Amino acid sequence: TXXXXXXXXX
Amino acid sequence: MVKVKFKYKGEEKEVDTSKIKKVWRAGKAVSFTYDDNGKTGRGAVSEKDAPKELLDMLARAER
């Protein structure tokens, strides 16, 4: 997506 | 003389086992507090990634 998961590292 | 390396707010940090104060068991994580010179700082790591000296400290705080 990369989900970037944004890692969000959250 | 054990080091503990943890991510705080997406920022990498670490500190000596000595400098630590409070160690709580929070599910799969070890939550804790330490003395960063004058101030108090807070942090946590997963129980899986933890050095043995930390986990000993945790068993000691459970009596």
Side-chain angles (χ1 to χ4, degrees), chain A residues 2-10, chain B residues 1-2 4 6-8 10-15 17-27 29-38 41-47 49-56 58-59 61-63:
Chain B
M1 172 35 48
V2 176
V4 175
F6 59 104
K7 201 141 157 177
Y8 177 83
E11 171 192 0
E12 289 304 346
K13 298 198 166 129
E14 103 287 10
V15 311
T17 283
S18 65
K19 314 184 251 251
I20 294 174
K21 326 196 291 213
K22 317 282 235 161
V23 70
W24 289 288
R25 182 165 240 126
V30 187
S31 182
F32 60 85
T33 82
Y34 57 88
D35 190 88
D36 45 9
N37 225 58
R42 284 172 135 292
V45 317
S46 86
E47 161 259 328
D49 319 330
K52 177 190 186 288
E53 164 77 338
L54 185 69
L55 295 163
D56 293 0
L58 182 46
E62 302 165 299
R63 290 82 40 94

